[PDB]
Amino acid sequence: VLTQNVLSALEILRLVRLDLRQLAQSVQDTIQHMRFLYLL
Amino acid sequence: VELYRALDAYRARIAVEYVLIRAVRDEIYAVLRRDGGALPQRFACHVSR
């Protein structure tokens, strides 16, 4: 009565991993943005 | 890159009076070098040796 629930949560945890990758890309993008623009 | 170029254009915008000020400063120093520090009187004032 539990394995089905853990896999059905994994079905959303995959999207969580996707969102982790998205946020890390955003953080690197912002750092590159700032480093290019603002450091004369 | 567009924001970078826009910032550079803004920099050129506000620099316009300061580059003229530096032009005058360099002109004063250039004339002072050319003359040898000899300044002729151009304004009236009784002077003492």
Coordinates of all heavy atoms in Angstrom, one line a residue:
Chain A
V1 N 0.8 -1.2 0.0 CA 0.0 0.0 0.0 C 0.9 1.2 0.0 O 0.4 2.3 0.3 CB -1.0 0.0 1.2 CG1 -2.2 -0.9 0.9 CG2 -0.2 -0.4 2.5
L2 N 2.2 1.1 -0.3 CA 3.1 2.2 -0.2 C 3.9 2.4 -1.5 O 4.1 3.6 -1.9 CB 4.0 2.1 1.0 CG 5.0 3.2 1.2 CD1 4.4 4.6 1.2 CD2 5.7 3.0 2.5
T3 N 4.3 1.3 -2.1 CA 5.2 1.4 -3.3 C 4.5 2.2 -4.4 O 5.1 3.1 -5.1 CB 5.6 0.0 -3.8 OG1 6.4 -0.6 -2.9 CG2 6.3 0.1 -5.2
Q4 N 3.2 2.0 -4.6 CA 2.5 2.7 -5.7 C 2.5 4.2 -5.4 O 2.7 5.1 -6.3 CB 1.1 2.2 -5.7 CG 0.4 1.8 -4.4 CD -0.2 3.0 -3.7 OE1 -0.7 4.0 -4.3 NE2 -0.4 2.9 -2.4
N5 N 2.4 4.6 -4.1 CA 2.4 6.0 -3.7 C 3.8 6.6 -4.0 O 3.9 7.8 -4.4 CB 2.0 6.2 -2.3 CG 1.5 7.7 -2.0 OD1 1.1 8.0 -0.9 ND2 1.5 8.5 -3.0
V6 N 4.9 5.9 -3.6 CA 6.2 6.4 -3.8 C 6.5 6.6 -5.3 O 7.1 7.6 -5.7 CB 7.3 5.6 -3.1 CG1 6.8 5.3 -1.6 CG2 7.6 4.3 -3.8
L7 N 6.1 5.7 -6.1 CA 6.3 5.9 -7.6 C 5.4 7.0 -8.1 O 5.8 7.7 -9.0 CB 6.1 4.6 -8.3 CG 4.8 3.9 -8.5 CD1 4.1 4.3 -9.8 CD2 4.9 2.4 -8.4
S8 N 4.2 7.1 -7.6 CA 3.3 8.2 -8.1 C 3.8 9.5 -7.6 O 3.5 10.5 -8.3 CB 1.9 7.9 -7.6 OG 1.7 8.2 -6.2
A9 N 4.6 9.6 -6.6 CA 5.3 10.8 -6.2 C 6.5 11.0 -7.1 O 6.9 12.2 -7.4 CB 5.6 10.8 -4.7
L10 N 7.2 9.9 -7.4 CA 8.4 10.0 -8.3 C 7.9 10.6 -9.7 O 8.7 11.3 -10.3 CB 9.0 8.7 -8.5 CG 10.2 8.3 -7.7 CD1 10.4 6.8 -7.6 CD2 11.4 9.0 -8.3
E11 N 6.7 10.3 -10.1 CA 6.2 10.9 -11.3 C 6.1 12.4 -11.3 O 6.0 13.0 -12.4 CB 4.7 10.3 -11.5 CG 4.7 9.0 -12.2 CD 3.3 8.4 -12.3 OE1 2.4 9.1 -11.9 OE2 3.2 7.2 -12.7
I12 N 6.2 13.0 -10.1 CA 6.3 14.5 -10.0 C 7.7 14.9 -9.6 O 8.1 16.1 -9.9 CB 5.2 15.0 -9.0 CG1 3.8 14.5 -9.4 CG2 5.2 16.5 -8.9 CD1 2.8 14.7 -8.3
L13 N 8.4 14.0 -9.0 CA 9.8 14.3 -8.6 C 10.7 14.4 -9.8 O 11.7 15.2 -9.8 CB 10.3 13.2 -7.7 CG 9.7 13.2 -6.3 CD1 10.2 12.0 -5.5 CD2 9.9 14.5 -5.5
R14 N 10.3 13.8 -10.9 CA 11.0 14.0 -12.2 C 10.8 15.4 -12.7 O 11.8 16.1 -13.1 CB 10.4 13.0 -13.3 CG 11.5 12.4 -14.1 CD 11.0 11.1 -14.7 NE 11.6 10.8 -16.0 CZ 11.7 9.6 -16.5 NH1 11.3 8.5 -15.9 NH2 12.2 9.5 -17.7
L15 N 9.6 16.0 -12.6 CA 9.4 17.4 -12.9 C 10.2 18.3 -11.9 O 10.6 19.4 -12.3 CB 7.9 17.7 -12.8 CG 7.1 17.5 -14.1 CD1 6.9 16.0 -14.4 CD2 5.8 18.3 -14.0
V16 N 10.3 17.8 -10.7 CA 11.1 18.6 -9.7 C 12.6 18.7 -10.1 O 13.2 19.7 -10.0 CB 11.0 18.0 -8.3 CG1 11.8 18.8 -7.3 CG2 9.5 18.0 -7.9
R17 N 13.2 17.5 -10.6 CA 14.5 17.5 -11.1 C 14.6 18.5 -12.3 O 15.6 19.2 -12.5 CB 14.9 16.1 -11.6 CG 16.1 15.5 -10.8 CD 16.2 14.1 -11.3 NE 16.7 14.1 -12.7 CZ 16.4 13.2 -13.6 NH1 15.5 12.2 -13.4 NH2 16.9 13.2 -14.8
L18 N 13.6 18.5 -13.2 CA 13.6 19.4 -14.3 C 13.6 20.8 -13.8 O 14.4 21.7 -14.4 CB 12.3 19.2 -15.1 CG 11.9 20.4 -16.0 CD1 12.7 20.5 -17.2 CD2 10.4 20.2 -16.4
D19 N 12.9 21.2 -12.8 CA 12.8 22.5 -12.3 C 14.2 22.9 -11.6 O 14.6 24.1 -11.7 CB 11.6 22.7 -11.3 CG 10.3 23.0 -12.1 OD1 10.4 23.0 -13.3 OD2 9.3 23.2 -11.4
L20 N 14.8 21.9 -11.0 CA 16.2 22.2 -10.5 C 17.1 22.5 -11.6 O 17.9 23.5 -11.4 CB 16.7 20.9 -9.7 CG 16.6 20.9 -8.2 CD1 16.9 19.5 -7.7 CD2 17.6 21.9 -7.6
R21 N 17.1 21.8 -12.7 CA 18.0 22.1 -13.8 C 17.6 23.5 -14.3 O 18.5 24.3 -14.7 CB 17.8 21.0 -14.9 CG 18.7 19.8 -14.6 CD 18.5 18.7 -15.7 NE 17.2 18.0 -15.6 CZ 16.8 17.0 -16.3 NH1 17.6 16.5 -17.2 NH2 15.6 16.5 -16.1
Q22 N 16.3 23.8 -14.4 CA 15.9 25.1 -14.9 C 16.5 26.2 -14.0 O 17.0 27.3 -14.5 CB 14.4 25.2 -15.0 CG 13.9 26.5 -15.7 CD 12.4 26.4 -16.0 OE1 11.8 25.4 -15.8 NE2 11.8 27.5 -16.5
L23 N 16.4 26.1 -12.7 CA 16.8 27.1 -11.8 C 18.3 27.3 -11.9 O 18.8 28.4 -11.8 CB 16.3 26.9 -10.4 CG 17.1 25.9 -9.5 CD1 18.2 26.7 -8.6 CD2 16.2 25.2 -8.5
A24 N 19.1 26.2 -11.9 CA 20.5 26.3 -12.0 C 20.9 27.0 -13.3 O 21.8 27.8 -13.3 CB 21.1 24.9 -11.9
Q25 N 20.3 26.7 -14.4 CA 20.5 27.4 -15.7 C 20.2 28.9 -15.5 O 21.0 29.7 -16.0 CB 19.7 26.8 -16.8 CG 20.5 25.7 -17.6 CD 19.8 25.4 -18.9 OE1 18.9 26.1 -19.4 NE2 20.1 24.2 -19.5
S26 N 19.1 29.2 -14.8 CA 18.8 30.6 -14.6 C 19.9 31.3 -13.8 O 20.2 32.5 -14.0 CB 17.4 30.8 -13.9 OG 16.4 30.5 -14.9
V27 N 20.4 30.6 -12.7 CA 21.4 31.3 -11.9 C 22.7 31.5 -12.7 O 23.3 32.6 -12.6 CB 21.6 30.4 -10.6 CG1 23.0 30.7 -10.1 CG2 20.6 30.6 -9.6
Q28 N 23.1 30.5 -13.5 CA 24.3 30.7 -14.3 C 24.1 31.8 -15.3 O 25.0 32.6 -15.6 CB 24.7 29.4 -15.0 CG 25.4 28.4 -14.1 CD 26.0 27.3 -15.0 OE1 25.5 27.0 -16.1 NE2 27.0 26.6 -14.4
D29 N 22.9 31.9 -15.9 CA 22.5 32.9 -16.9 C 22.6 34.3 -16.2 O 23.2 35.2 -16.8 CB 21.1 32.7 -17.5 CG 21.1 31.5 -18.4 OD1 22.2 31.2 -19.0 OD2 20.0 30.9 -18.6
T30 N 22.1 34.4 -15.0 CA 22.1 35.7 -14.3 C 23.6 36.1 -14.0 O 24.0 37.3 -14.1 CB 21.3 35.7 -13.1 OG1 21.6 34.5 -12.3 CG2 19.8 35.8 -13.4
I31 N 24.4 35.1 -13.6 CA 25.8 35.5 -13.2 C 26.5 35.9 -14.5 O 27.3 36.9 -14.5 CB 26.4 34.3 -12.6 CG1 26.4 34.4 -11.0 CG2 27.9 34.2 -13.0 CD1 25.0 34.4 -10.5
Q32 N 26.3 35.2 -15.6 CA 26.9 35.6 -16.9 C 26.4 37.0 -17.3 O 27.2 37.8 -17.8 CB 26.7 34.6 -17.9 CG 27.5 34.8 -19.2 CD 29.0 34.8 -18.9 OE1 29.5 33.8 -18.3 NE2 29.7 35.8 -19.4
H33 N 25.1 37.3 -17.2 CA 24.6 38.6 -17.5 C 25.3 39.7 -16.7 O 25.8 40.6 -17.3 CB 23.1 38.5 -17.1 CG 22.3 39.8 -17.4 ND1 21.5 40.0 -18.4 CD2 22.3 40.9 -16.6 CE1 21.0 41.2 -18.4 NE2 21.4 41.8 -17.3
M34 N 25.4 39.5 -15.4 CA 26.0 40.5 -14.6 C 27.5 40.6 -14.9 O 28.0 41.7 -15.0 CB 25.8 40.2 -13.1 CG 24.4 40.4 -12.6 SD 23.7 39.0 -11.6 CE 24.8 39.1 -10.2
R35 N 28.2 39.5 -15.0 CA 29.6 39.5 -15.3 C 30.0 40.2 -16.6 O 30.9 41.0 -16.7 CB 30.2 38.1 -15.3 CG 31.7 38.0 -15.0 CD 32.0 38.0 -13.5 NE 33.2 37.2 -13.2 CZ 34.4 37.7 -13.3 NH1 34.7 38.9 -13.7 NH2 35.4 36.9 -12.9
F36 N 29.2 40.0 -17.6 CA 29.4 40.6 -18.9 C 29.1 42.1 -18.8 O 29.9 42.9 -19.2 CB 28.5 40.0 -20.0 CG 28.5 40.7 -21.3 CD1 29.6 41.2 -21.8 CD2 27.3 40.9 -22.0 CE1 29.6 41.9 -23.1 CE2 27.2 41.5 -23.2 CZ 28.4 42.0 -23.7
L37 N 27.9 42.5 -18.3 CA 27.5 43.9 -18.4 C 28.2 44.8 -17.4 O 28.8 45.8 -17.8 CB 26.0 44.0 -18.1 CG 25.1 43.7 -19.3 CD1 23.7 43.3 -18.9 CD2 25.0 45.0 -20.1
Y38 N 28.2 44.4 -16.1 CA 28.4 45.4 -15.1 C 29.9 45.5 -14.6 O 30.2 46.5 -13.9 CB 27.5 45.1 -13.9 CG 26.1 45.1 -14.2 CD1 25.3 44.1 -13.9 CD2 25.5 46.2 -14.9 CE1 23.9 44.1 -14.3 CE2 24.2 46.2 -15.3 CZ 23.4 45.1 -14.9 OH 22.1 45.1 -15.3
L39 N 30.8 44.6 -15.0 CA 32.2 44.7 -14.6 C 33.0 45.2 -15.7 O 33.6 44.5 -16.5 CB 32.6 43.3 -14.2 CG 31.6 42.7 -13.1 CD1 32.2 41.4 -12.6 CD2 31.3 43.6 -12.0
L40 N 33.1 46.6 -15.7 CA 34.0 47.3 -16.6 C 35.5 47.1 -16.3 O 35.8 47.0 -15.1 CB 33.6 48.8 -16.6 CG 34.4 49.7 -17.6 CD1 34.1 49.4 -19.0 CD2 34.2 51.2 -17.2
Chain B
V1 N 24.0 42.2 -25.1 CA 24.9 43.0 -25.9 C 24.2 44.3 -26.2 O 24.9 45.4 -26.3 CB 25.3 42.3 -27.1 CG1 26.3 41.2 -26.8 CG2 24.1 41.7 -27.9
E2 N 22.9 44.3 -26.4 CA 22.2 45.5 -26.7 C 22.2 46.5 -25.5 O 22.4 47.7 -25.7 CB 20.8 45.2 -27.2 CG 20.7 44.5 -28.5 CD 19.4 44.7 -29.2 OE1 19.0 45.9 -29.4 OE2 18.7 43.7 -29.6
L3 N 21.9 46.0 -24.3 CA 22.0 46.8 -23.1 C 23.4 47.3 -22.9 O 23.6 48.5 -22.5 CB 21.6 46.0 -21.9 CG 21.6 46.9 -20.6 CD1 20.6 48.0 -20.7 CD2 21.3 46.0 -19.4
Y4 N 24.4 46.5 -23.3 CA 25.8 47.0 -23.2 C 26.1 48.1 -24.1 O 26.7 49.1 -23.7 CB 26.8 45.8 -23.5 CG 28.2 46.1 -23.2 CD1 28.8 45.9 -22.0 CD2 29.1 46.4 -24.3 CE1 30.1 46.2 -21.7 CE2 30.4 46.7 -24.0 CZ 30.9 46.5 -22.8 OH 32.2 46.8 -22.5
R5 N 25.6 48.0 -25.4 CA 25.8 49.1 -26.3 C 25.1 50.4 -25.9 O 25.5 51.5 -26.1 CB 25.5 48.7 -27.7 CG 25.7 49.7 -28.8 CD 25.3 49.2 -30.1 NE 23.9 48.8 -30.2 CZ 23.5 47.8 -30.9 NH1 24.3 47.0 -31.6 NH2 22.1 47.5 -30.9
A6 N 23.8 50.2 -25.4 CA 23.0 51.3 -24.9 C 23.7 52.0 -23.8 O 23.7 53.2 -23.7 CB 21.6 50.8 -24.5
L7 N 24.3 51.2 -22.8 CA 25.1 51.8 -21.7 C 26.3 52.6 -22.3 O 26.6 53.7 -21.8 CB 25.5 50.8 -20.8 CG 24.5 50.2 -19.8 CD1 25.0 48.9 -19.1 CD2 24.1 51.2 -18.7
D8 N 26.9 52.1 -23.3 CA 28.1 52.8 -23.9 C 27.6 54.1 -24.5 O 28.3 55.1 -24.4 CB 28.8 51.9 -24.9 CG 29.7 50.9 -24.2 OD1 29.6 50.8 -23.0 OD2 30.4 50.1 -24.9
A9 N 26.5 54.1 -25.2 CA 25.9 55.3 -25.8 C 25.6 56.3 -24.7 O 25.8 57.5 -24.9 CB 24.7 55.0 -26.7
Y10 N 25.0 55.8 -23.6 CA 24.7 56.7 -22.5 C 26.0 57.3 -21.9 O 26.0 58.5 -21.6 CB 23.9 56.0 -21.4 CG 23.4 56.9 -20.3 CD1 22.4 57.8 -20.6 CD2 23.9 56.8 -19.1 CE1 21.9 58.6 -19.6 CE2 23.5 57.7 -18.1 CZ 22.5 58.6 -18.4 OH 22.0 59.4 -17.4
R11 N 27.0 56.5 -21.8 CA 28.3 57.0 -21.3 C 28.8 58.1 -22.2 O 29.3 59.2 -21.7 CB 29.3 55.8 -21.2 CG 30.6 56.2 -20.6 CD 31.7 56.6 -21.5 NE 33.0 56.7 -20.9 CZ 34.1 57.0 -21.5 NH1 34.2 57.1 -22.8 NH2 35.2 57.2 -20.8
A12 N 28.8 57.9 -23.5 CA 29.2 59.0 -24.4 C 28.3 60.2 -24.3 O 28.7 61.3 -24.5 CB 29.2 58.5 -25.9
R13 N 27.0 60.0 -23.9 CA 26.1 61.2 -23.8 C 26.5 62.1 -22.7 O 26.6 63.3 -22.9 CB 24.7 60.7 -23.6 CG 23.7 61.8 -23.6 CD 22.3 61.4 -23.7 NE 21.4 62.6 -23.8 CZ 20.8 63.1 -22.7 NH1 21.0 62.6 -21.5 NH2 20.1 64.2 -22.9
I14 N 26.8 61.5 -21.5 CA 27.0 62.4 -20.3 C 28.4 62.9 -20.3 O 28.7 63.8 -19.5 CB 26.6 61.6 -19.0 CG1 27.7 60.6 -18.7 CG2 25.3 60.8 -19.2 CD1 27.4 59.8 -17.4
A15 N 29.3 62.3 -21.1 CA 30.7 62.7 -21.1 C 31.0 64.0 -21.8 O 32.1 64.4 -21.8 CB 31.6 61.5 -21.6
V16 N 30.0 64.5 -22.5 CA 30.2 65.6 -23.4 C 30.8 66.9 -22.8 O 31.6 67.5 -23.4 CB 29.0 65.9 -24.3 CG1 27.9 66.6 -23.4 CG2 29.3 66.7 -25.5
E17 N 30.3 67.2 -21.6 CA 30.8 68.4 -21.0 C 32.2 68.2 -20.3 O 33.1 69.1 -20.3 CB 29.8 69.0 -19.9 CG 29.5 68.1 -18.8 CD 28.2 67.3 -19.0 OE1 27.8 67.1 -20.2 OE2 27.5 66.9 -18.1
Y18 N 32.5 67.0 -19.8 CA 33.7 66.7 -19.2 C 34.9 66.6 -20.2 O 36.0 67.0 -19.9 CB 33.6 65.4 -18.4 CG 32.6 65.6 -17.3 CD1 31.4 64.8 -17.4 CD2 32.7 66.4 -16.3 CE1 30.4 64.9 -16.5 CE2 31.7 66.5 -15.3 CZ 30.6 65.8 -15.4 OH 29.6 65.9 -14.5
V19 N 34.6 66.1 -21.4 CA 35.6 66.1 -22.4 C 36.0 67.5 -22.9 O 37.2 67.8 -23.2 CB 35.2 65.2 -23.6 CG1 34.0 65.7 -24.2 CG2 36.4 65.0 -24.6
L20 N 35.0 68.4 -22.9 CA 35.3 69.8 -23.2 C 36.1 70.4 -22.1 O 37.1 71.2 -22.3 CB 34.0 70.6 -23.4 CG 33.3 70.3 -24.7 CD1 31.8 70.8 -24.5 CD2 33.9 71.0 -25.9
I21 N 35.8 70.1 -20.8 CA 36.6 70.6 -19.7 C 38.0 70.2 -19.8 O 39.0 70.9 -19.6 CB 36.0 70.2 -18.4 CG1 34.7 71.1 -18.2 CG2 36.9 70.4 -17.2 CD1 33.8 70.5 -17.1
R22 N 38.2 68.9 -20.1 CA 39.6 68.4 -20.3 C 40.3 69.0 -21.5 O 41.5 69.1 -21.5 CB 39.6 66.8 -20.4 CG 39.2 66.1 -19.1 CD 39.4 64.6 -19.2 NE 38.7 64.1 -20.3 CZ 37.5 63.4 -20.2 NH1 37.0 63.2 -19.0 NH2 36.9 62.9 -21.2
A23 N 39.6 69.3 -22.5 CA 40.2 69.9 -23.7 C 40.7 71.3 -23.2 O 41.9 71.6 -23.6 CB 39.1 70.1 -24.8
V24 N 40.0 72.0 -22.5 CA 40.5 73.3 -22.0 C 41.7 73.1 -21.0 O 42.6 73.9 -21.1 CB 39.4 74.1 -21.3 CG1 39.9 75.4 -20.6 CG2 38.3 74.5 -22.3
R25 N 41.6 72.1 -20.2 CA 42.7 71.9 -19.3 C 44.0 71.5 -20.0 O 45.1 72.1 -19.7 CB 42.4 70.7 -18.3 CG 43.5 70.3 -17.4 CD 43.2 68.9 -16.9 NE 43.4 67.9 -17.9 CZ 43.0 66.7 -17.9 NH1 42.2 66.3 -16.9 NH2 43.3 65.8 -18.9
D26 N 43.9 70.6 -21.0 CA 45.1 70.3 -21.8 C 45.5 71.5 -22.6 O 46.7 71.6 -22.8 CB 44.7 69.1 -22.7 CG 44.2 67.9 -22.0 OD1 44.4 67.8 -20.8 OD2 43.7 67.0 -22.7
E27 N 44.6 72.3 -23.0 CA 45.0 73.5 -23.7 C 45.8 74.5 -22.8 O 46.8 75.1 -23.3 CB 43.8 74.2 -24.3 CG 44.1 75.3 -25.3 CD 44.9 74.8 -26.5 OE1 44.6 73.7 -26.9 OE2 45.8 75.5 -27.0
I28 N 45.4 74.7 -21.6 CA 46.1 75.5 -20.7 C 47.5 75.0 -20.4 O 48.5 75.7 -20.5 CB 45.3 75.6 -19.3 CG1 44.1 76.5 -19.5 CG2 46.2 76.1 -18.2 CD1 43.2 76.5 -18.3
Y29 N 47.6 73.7 -20.2 CA 49.0 73.1 -20.0 C 49.8 73.1 -21.2 O 51.0 73.3 -21.1 CB 48.8 71.7 -19.5 CG 48.5 71.6 -18.0 CD1 47.4 70.9 -17.5 CD2 49.3 72.3 -17.1 CE1 47.2 70.8 -16.2 CE2 49.1 72.2 -15.7 CZ 48.0 71.5 -15.3 OH 47.7 71.4 -13.9
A30 N 49.2 73.0 -22.4 CA 50.0 73.0 -23.7 C 50.5 74.4 -23.9 O 51.6 74.6 -24.3 CB 49.1 72.6 -24.8
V31 N 49.6 75.5 -23.7 CA 50.1 76.8 -23.9 C 51.2 77.2 -22.9 O 52.1 77.9 -23.2 CB 48.9 77.8 -23.8 CG1 49.3 79.2 -23.8 CG2 47.9 77.6 -24.9
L32 N 51.0 76.7 -21.6 CA 52.0 77.0 -20.6 C 53.3 76.3 -20.9 O 54.4 76.9 -20.7 CB 51.5 76.4 -19.3 CG 51.9 77.0 -17.9 CD1 51.7 78.5 -17.9 CD2 51.0 76.4 -16.9
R33 N 53.3 75.1 -21.5 CA 54.6 74.5 -22.0 C 55.2 75.3 -23.2 O 56.4 75.5 -23.3 CB 54.3 73.1 -22.4 CG 55.6 72.4 -22.9 CD 55.3 71.0 -23.4 NE 55.2 70.0 -22.4 CZ 56.3 69.4 -21.8 NH1 57.5 69.6 -22.3 NH2 56.1 68.5 -20.9
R34 N 54.3 75.7 -24.1 CA 54.8 76.4 -25.3 C 55.4 77.8 -25.0 O 56.5 78.1 -25.5 CB 53.6 76.6 -26.3 CG 53.9 77.4 -27.5 CD 52.7 78.1 -28.0 NE 52.2 79.2 -27.2 CZ 51.1 79.8 -27.3 NH1 50.2 79.4 -28.2 NH2 50.8 80.8 -26.5
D35 N 54.8 78.5 -24.1 CA 55.3 79.8 -23.7 C 56.5 79.8 -22.9 O 57.4 80.7 -22.9 CB 54.2 80.7 -23.1 CG 53.1 81.0 -24.0 OD1 53.2 80.7 -25.2 OD2 52.0 81.5 -23.5
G36 N 56.7 78.7 -22.1 CA 57.8 78.6 -21.1 C 57.5 79.2 -19.8 O 58.4 79.6 -19.0
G37 N 56.2 79.4 -19.5 CA 55.8 80.0 -18.2 C 55.8 81.5 -18.2 O 55.7 82.1 -17.1
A38 N 56.0 82.1 -19.3 CA 56.0 83.6 -19.4 C 54.5 84.0 -19.6 O 54.0 83.7 -20.7 CB 56.9 84.1 -20.5
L39 N 53.9 84.7 -18.7 CA 52.6 85.1 -18.8 C 52.5 86.7 -19.0 O 53.0 87.4 -18.1 CB 51.7 84.8 -17.6 CG 51.6 83.3 -17.4 CD1 50.6 82.9 -16.3 CD2 51.3 82.6 -18.7
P40 N 52.0 87.1 -20.1 CA 51.9 88.6 -20.4 C 50.7 89.1 -19.7 O 49.7 88.4 -19.5 CB 51.8 88.7 -21.9 CG 51.1 87.4 -22.3 CD 51.6 86.4 -21.3
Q41 N 50.7 90.4 -19.3 CA 49.5 91.0 -18.7 C 48.4 91.3 -19.7 O 48.7 91.9 -20.7 CB 49.9 92.3 -17.9 CG 49.0 92.5 -16.8 CD 49.3 93.7 -15.9 OE1 49.9 94.7 -16.5 NE2 49.0 93.7 -14.7
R42 N 47.2 90.8 -19.4 CA 46.1 91.0 -20.3 C 44.9 91.7 -19.5 O 43.9 92.1 -20.2 CB 45.6 89.7 -20.9 CG 46.6 89.1 -21.8 CD 46.8 89.9 -23.1 NE 47.9 89.4 -23.8 CZ 49.0 90.2 -24.1 NH1 49.1 91.4 -23.6 NH2 50.0 89.7 -24.8
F43 N 45.0 91.8 -18.2 CA 44.0 92.5 -17.4 C 44.6 93.5 -16.5 O 45.8 93.3 -16.0 CB 43.2 91.4 -16.5 CG 42.4 90.5 -17.4 CD1 43.0 89.5 -18.1 CD2 41.0 90.7 -17.4 CE1 42.2 88.6 -18.8 CE2 40.3 89.8 -18.2 CZ 40.8 88.8 -18.9
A44 N 43.9 94.6 -16.3 CA 44.5 95.8 -15.7 C 44.6 95.6 -14.1 O 43.6 95.3 -13.5 CB 43.7 97.1 -16.0
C45 N 45.8 95.7 -13.6 CA 46.0 95.6 -12.2 C 47.4 96.2 -11.9 O 48.4 95.6 -12.4 CB 45.8 94.2 -11.7 SG 45.9 94.0 -9.9
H46 N 47.5 97.2 -11.0 CA 48.8 97.7 -10.7 C 49.6 96.7 -9.8 O 49.1 96.2 -8.8 CB 48.7 99.0 -9.9 CG 48.2 100.1 -10.7 ND1 46.9 100.1 -11.3 CD2 48.7 101.4 -10.9 CE1 46.7 101.2 -11.9 NE2 47.7 102.0 -11.7
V47 N 50.8 96.4 -10.3 CA 51.6 95.2 -9.8 C 52.9 95.8 -9.1 O 53.4 96.8 -9.6 CB 51.9 94.2 -10.9 CG1 50.7 93.4 -11.2 CG2 52.5 94.9 -12.1
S48 N 53.4 95.0 -8.1 CA 54.6 95.4 -7.5 C 55.6 94.3 -7.8 O 55.3 93.1 -7.9 CB 54.4 95.5 -6.0 OG 55.6 95.7 -5.3
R49 N 56.9 94.8 -7.9 CA 58.0 93.8 -8.1 C 58.3 93.1 -6.8 O 58.6 91.9 -6.7 CB 59.2 94.5 -8.7 CG 60.4 93.6 -8.9 CD 61.5 94.3 -9.7 NE 61.2 94.3 -11.2 CZ 60.9 95.4 -11.9 NH1 60.8 96.6 -11.3 NH2 60.7 95.3 -13.2

